[model samples]
Target: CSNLSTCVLGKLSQELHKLQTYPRTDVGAGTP
Candidate 1:
């Protein structure tokens, strides 16, 4: 559970890394 949160911090940590990282950004069905 905590590790999952860790990745999220990393996701937004770069702040735009998500754009460069996750291409299948279906935020609704996935992370929210």
Candidate 2:
């Protein structure tokens, strides 16, 4: 994961829901 910092950050910065386990972003079922 260290070598993919840029690639990782870029995916993060997109702020898109596709990667969102929790729509705002993060892990879990995204449901409370």
Candidate 3:
């Protein structure tokens, strides 16, 4: 649904910020 997609985008945006602010080198599951 569009709502779910929107939520995903929001999460991705914050995720990107965290990824850049706190780069993780682990190769395990990187998603919630």
Best by TM-score: 3
Backbone-clash count (model 2): 0
In the range 1-32, model 2's lDDT, one tens digit per residue, is 46598878877777564655555534765555
RMSD of 1: 10.7
Candidate 1 lDDT over 1-32, as tens digits, reads 36898888876777786566666656567652
Considering lDDT, which of the candidate structures 2 and 3 is the better prediction for this target? Answer: 3
RMSD of 3: 8.6
Arrange candidates by TM-score, descending. Answer: 3, 2, 1
Question: What tens-digit string does per-residue lDDT give for candidate 3 at 1-32?
Answer: 36998889998898888787665554787553
Error of 2 at 10 (Å): 0.4
TM-score against native, each model? 0.30, 0.32, 0.44
Give the alpha-carbon lDDT of every model. Answer: 0.69, 0.64, 0.75
